Amino acid sequence: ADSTITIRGYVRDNGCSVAAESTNFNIGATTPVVPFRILLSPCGNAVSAVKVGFTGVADSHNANLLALENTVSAASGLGIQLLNEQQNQIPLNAPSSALSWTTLTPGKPNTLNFYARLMATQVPVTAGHINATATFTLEYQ
Amino acid sequence: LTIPQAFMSNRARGYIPPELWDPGINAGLLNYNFSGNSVQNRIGGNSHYAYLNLQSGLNIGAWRLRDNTTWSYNSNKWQHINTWLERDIIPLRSRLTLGDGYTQGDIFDGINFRGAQLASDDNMLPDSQRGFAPVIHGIARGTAQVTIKQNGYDIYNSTVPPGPFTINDIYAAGNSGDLQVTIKEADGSTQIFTVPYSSVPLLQREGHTRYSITAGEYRSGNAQQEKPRFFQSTLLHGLPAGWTIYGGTQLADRYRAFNFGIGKNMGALGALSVDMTQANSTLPDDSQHDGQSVRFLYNKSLNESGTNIQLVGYRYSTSGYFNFADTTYSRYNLAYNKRGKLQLTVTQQLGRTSTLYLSGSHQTYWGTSNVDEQFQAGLNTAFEDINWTLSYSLTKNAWQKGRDQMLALNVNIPFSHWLRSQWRHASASYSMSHDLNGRMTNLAGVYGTLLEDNNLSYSVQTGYAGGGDGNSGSTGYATLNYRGGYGNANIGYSHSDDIKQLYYGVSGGVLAHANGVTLGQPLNDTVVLVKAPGAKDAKVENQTGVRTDWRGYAVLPYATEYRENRVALDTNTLADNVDLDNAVANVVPTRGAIVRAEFKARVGIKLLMTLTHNNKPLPFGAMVTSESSQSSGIVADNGQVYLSGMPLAGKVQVKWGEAHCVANYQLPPESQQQLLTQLSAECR
Amino acid sequence: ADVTITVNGKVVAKPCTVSTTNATVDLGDLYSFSLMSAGAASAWHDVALELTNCPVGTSRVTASFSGAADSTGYYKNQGTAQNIQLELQDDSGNTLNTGATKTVQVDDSSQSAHFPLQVRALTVNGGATQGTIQAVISITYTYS
Amino acid sequence: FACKTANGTAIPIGGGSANVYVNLAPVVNVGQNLVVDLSTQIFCHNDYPETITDYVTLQRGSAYGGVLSNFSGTVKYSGSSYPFPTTSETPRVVYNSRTDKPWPVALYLTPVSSAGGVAIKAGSLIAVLILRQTNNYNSDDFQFVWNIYANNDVVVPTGGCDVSARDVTVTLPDYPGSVPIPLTVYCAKSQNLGYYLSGTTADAGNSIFTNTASFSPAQGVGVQLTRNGTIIPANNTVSLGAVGTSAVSLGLTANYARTGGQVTAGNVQSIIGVTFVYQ
Amino acid sequence: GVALGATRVIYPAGQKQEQLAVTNNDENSTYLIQSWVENADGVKDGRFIVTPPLFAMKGKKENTLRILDATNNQLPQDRESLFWMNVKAIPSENTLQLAIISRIKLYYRPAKLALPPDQAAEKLRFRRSANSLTLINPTPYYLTVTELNAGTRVLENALVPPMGESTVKLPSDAGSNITYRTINDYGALTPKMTGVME
C-alpha cells in the first residue's frame, strides 16, 4: 500500500562436516579390533549419496595392508587392517570405479563405524612403536 | 559417573559467555540527516523548508554518550532534543541510563523523563531464553533419549542421564501448538506427556526476573504541564506451574500508584493475566481522589482450525482513577476520564493462501456518552505471485462526529511473472480505495531496484482521485532513493492537481577513531568498523552498498548486540595485488559498541616459489618468511610455497627444524600484471 | 464584558509524505547447515521507514503491516526455498506479523516520523531447503 | 374604568394594583434611551363616561426595581418631559371615553456606560410605579402600586451605543484557517470609540487566548484576533474613529496561533470579551 | 570437522578467480588445510591454483579459498570440462590418525554456450541391450544422473560426459520404462523424468 518491504535472498547447500576419531593401541596374527567412527554432521539436505574411500602407504608384504610410519623403532611385518561395519576388508587405495555410493539421511547426523586391527605377517615380528596416518576420502555426488 | 542433568549446570544453545562480549573501541560518532522541500502552488507561490537532524555521540571504553540537535529553516536556530549517557551492567544483566529517557509501558503508562534508570536487559539472554516457554520437568529410569515434537516436527532432541531432568531451552514458539515430550529408555519403554502453552506479553519464563528502577523528573513536551519529580519501580517474576507474579509502584508529590497482578499459562485454555492498580492522585485544583483500575489480558494460540486469539484485553477504571500525566498540569478533560478500554486482535487462516485479520479498540469515558472506536479487518490472498489485499478500516473519535471508513483493494504483481533485463527486480501495484462516502481513488505504480548492487530504488506511481467532495484530480509521486558507501540520498517529486512539491535529502554517518575519519551509511545503535588497510574497494558481502574507503575502512551501520556477527570481505572485488590473510571475522559487540574487524591485506605481487634444498624439495610443513616484507607461508607438496605481498626482488628465510636456508629471487619488472607468478629458488 | 465572542474550531491530523516507498532487504546467500535445526534463524537485517513533512496536527503515526502468512504465522516465502519463513520485528523485540500495527510519535522539531524495523529468515520446522527467498510486506499508515 | 393589553391582560389584584406582561423594544437614542413604551400596550377606557370622569396621575416615589433600581432617566407623561425618579406629583390625565385610547407614558434611561447593557430575563420585575386615581363624581381618590414585568428576554442598552449582537459565536475551519467575526456598532451621536479585548491569554505578549476546551482540548494551539492583518493584544485599546448612526464594522478576524510545542489534534475553544471605551 | 561451502564449483570461462568457503565448527580442534585441483585423469596439472594452498585453522574458524585459473584459454570452448577439487584437513602415542579429504566437482564452463543449463537434463537418450543400458548425452554439459529406476530395480548413478555416453549395468529383472533425475548447477535435484529409447 503506502510502503512495501521486499525481502530477497538465497539459501545454498553445503557439504558434510566430517569429524574423525583417532584410534589408540604364527603368521597372519590379528589383534583384537579397536572401533572408531566418522561423524557426518550437520549434512545438507541435498547431500543424498557420497563415496567413501581409504588411502595410505601400502605395506611391502601386501598392498591391502596400511603400512606403518618409518619410525626409528617400528615393528617389522606389522600393518593395520581396516574393517568396515560388516567386518570386511576395505580395499586400500581403491579407485573411484571400485568405490561405491553410500546413502545418507538428510538432517539427522550420519555415522560410519569402522574397526582397526594390527596384523603381523613377518613372524617373529619385532617390537616397535605403532603409528599410522591414513586418509579418508569423501567424494560428493 | 552418572549424574542427573537437573543440577549439571547445562548451558543453553546459543550461550555466549559474558567474557566474549566486546565493549567496543573509543570513538566519536555523528549522524547527519538533511531533508528539505520546495513547494510550488498555483495560488501562493513558492515555499521552502529544510531540517538538519544531527546526532552526536562518543564511546569511551564502556559508556555511550549521545546527543540530538535539529536546525530548522522555513520560508532558524538549533534546538536541543535529547542527551543521555548509558552503560550496561554485565553482572546484573542490566543497563543504566543517565539523562533524557523514557520508561516502559509494561505496567504503568509510558513516561518521558530526565533522570536515572537501571532496567534489566532481555538481549543479554540467549535466543532460546527470551520470551515464554514451559520448563519441561521429567524423570528417567536410566540413560534415556528425550524428544519434543511440536506440530509433528522434532524441535528438541537430547540424551539424558538417569535421574530427574529439566529442560529450559525451548524457543518461544507458542503459536505452533503443544509440545509432546517423549522419553525413550534404553530397553524401549516410552513415557509420553503433552505440554500445551500460550503466553500473554507479561508472562516470564520460570525463574526469570525482570525489573526496572527509574528516578527522575517527568518531561512532557507541553508548555502548560509541570515537571514533577517521581520514582517508579516495576518487577516481574516467573514462577513454577506456568505462573507469573508482577507488580510495581509510582511515587510522586501528588501521585501514588501501586500495581499488583498475576498471569497464568492455563494451557488448553490459553494464557490469562489479571492485574489491579490503585492510584491516589491530587488534581491540579488541589482535590484528592482515589481509584482502582483492573486489567485482564487473554491470549490463545493457534488451533487446528487455524484461528488464534492474539489478544483480548479489557481495562476498567473507576471514577477516581487518574494517570500520572493527569496530575501534572500547571495550577482540561479531567471530568471525562476513561471508563473502560476493550481491545481485540484475532487471526484466521482460510486455506493455504488466504488469511483473515481482525483488530479493534473501544474506549468509553466517564460522564460523556462519546466512545472512541477503531476497527480494522483485512483479507490477504497469495495466489502464486499476485498478492491481493482487501482491507477495511473504521475510526471514530470521541471529540468529533462522524465515522471515517475506508475500503481498499491492493494488487501486487512482480514483473518476473510476465517475463521469464533490469525489470526482474520490479513489480506493479494497483490500489483502489473507496471512502464509502462517494470518494474513490485509483493508483498505479511501478517500483524496484535499479543498480548493479541494487542500491538505487525507484518508485513511480500515478493516480486519479474523484467523487465525494468533487475535487477530481490526478496525482503522481516519483521517488528515487540511493544507498552508497558514503551515505544515503533521496529525491522525490509529488505533482498534485495544484500543489507541485520537490523533496530532497541526504543522510549519513561519520566515525572518528585513532585511524582518522570514516564515512558511511546512517549508523544504527551498534556499529562495526571494517579495518582492512590496503583494500581500496572490497565489498562487505551480505551488506547493500557497503564498500571500503580509499584507505580501507568501512563502517557497517547495523550489528546485532550480544550476538555473533560475521563480517566478511568479498574476494572477487579485491585488487589484483591484494590478498587477505583471512577474509572473514567474527564480532560479539555490546549495545552501542563500535567494534573493529581488523583484516590483514598484504599488498604486492603474489608468487608460488618452488624451493629446492640439497637438490631435493623442501620438507612438508616447513615455515617460510620474507625478510623485507611480512609475508609467511607453509611449504606444501613438491616444495611449493605461496607468498602474498612480496617485493619485486628480496630474500626468503626457510625454517623446518633446529634459519636453515636462504632464497633469493629476481622477477622481471613486468611480472606485476599477472595475478599469480611461479618461479624456482635454491638454498645454501 | 460588553460583547462576548465564542471562537470554536478543531485541529485535525493530516497525512504526511512517505520517504521510503519500496524498501528492500537483501539477506544475501544463506547456508543450509546454519538453518537446519528447528527455530534456527539468519542474521537480523535492519530496514527503516521514514516519513517527512508531517503537517502540524499530526502527532502520531500508526503503521499496519500485511502479508501472506503461512500456517506458522510468519510471512510466507514465495521463492523456491521451503521450510523457511520471513520474520519482521521492531527494535523493541515485538513480532510485527501480518495485521500488526505499531505507533510512533512525530518529532516536532523536524516534523518527521521513523519506524525502526529488522527482518530475518528463520526455519520453524527445521530443514531449510535450498532455493530462492522472496517476500513482500505492505505497510499502510494512519495519522492521528 | 377598565384597562387591558392585547398580549398579557393581567388580572388586577388588590384593588387598582396590577402587574403587566409587555414586550420590550429598547433603542438607543440621543440624550436618553427608551426602555418601555406603554402607549402601544396599555389601553384604558371609562365604563361610564357620562356619569364619572377619571383622573389618573403618577405620585412621587415611582422608581425601578432589582438591577435597574440604581438607574434613572425621564418619563414622557402625555408628551411632557418629567425627571425620573418621581420626586413630585405629575399633572393628571383625564379619562371620559369608552374607547381604548393609548396611555401616553414613555420610560427612558440615562446613559451611564459607553456601550454596555444589562440583561433582564422574562418574568422579572423592572419598574414599580405609584398611581393615584380620582374622579369627578365624588371625592373617591385611591392610590395603588403597579409592577411592570417582562414577558421576553432582551438586553436594554445602558450606554450611548448599540451593537449587532451581544453574543457572537464563530467556527473556524480546521487548522489552519480564519473567520471574520460578524459584529458592528452604531451610536446615537458621532463620537469616538475604543475597544479592548479580554480573556485568559497564553503567550507573554497577551495576544494568544488560551484554548479553554472542555472535552479533548487541542494542546499547543490557541486563538488570536486580528484586524486588517494586525495582531490585537488583550487589554489594548483599538480606536474605531468617528462612529455615527451608521453601523461600523470592527473588522475582527479570528485566527489560529501556536502557543507551545507539539500540536495535538482535538477541539479548540476560546471565549473573548470586548469592552467599549469612550475616547 | 571441516566443511566445504558447496558440493560443486562452476567456473565460468574468462573469470579472474572463483571463491569457496571452508568452515571448522570444532572449538578445540586444529587443522592444516591443503587444497588442490586435479584434472579428469586424477593427476595434479596445476591448471587451477587454490590459494592459500596450505593454511592452518585454529578452533572454530571460517576461511575463504580462491581458485585461480591458469588455462589461458587453452581448453576446449565448445564443451564443459571436469576437474576434481580436493580439500584435505590434516589434524594437528600409538595412535592411528585420519586426514579427511573432501572431493567436489569443478565444472569449467566455456562462455557463449548454446543450450541453457536448465534444459540440458531433458535431452538425454537411452538404449537398452543385453544386461547393459547406455545413456547418450548430446548436450555440451556434464550430466549427473541419479536415482535411475528401470521399472522397479534401482540402477547406479552416473556422470555422462558432454556430447558423450556412459554405460550402466542392467539386471534382467527390469521394467520397460526408466525414470531418472539429474543434479543441476546449484546441487539441487531436478524433477523426475522419463527416458526415451534410441
Author numbering:
A (entry chain F): 1 to 25, 39 to 154
B (entry chain D): 113 to 187, 196 to 451, 474 to 562, 567 to 804, 808 to 833
C (entry chain G): 1 to 144
D (entry chain H): 1 to 279
E (entry chain C): 1 to 92, 100 to 205
Please quote the paper that reports this structure.
As a consequence of the fact that incorporation of the first FimA subunit is rate limiting for pilus rod assembly, we obtained a mixture of FimD-rod complexes and FimDHGFC complexes that had not yet incorporated a single FimA after completion of FimD-catalyzed tip assembly. In conformer 1, the structure closely resembles PDB-ID 6E1522, with the NTD remaining unoccupied. However, the resolution did not allow unambiguous assignment of the incorporated subunits. The FimD-rod and FimDHGFC structures provide further insight into pilus assembly and suggest that FimD quickly adopts the post-handover conformation on the periplasmic side, driven by quaternary structure formation of the pilus rod on the extracellular side.
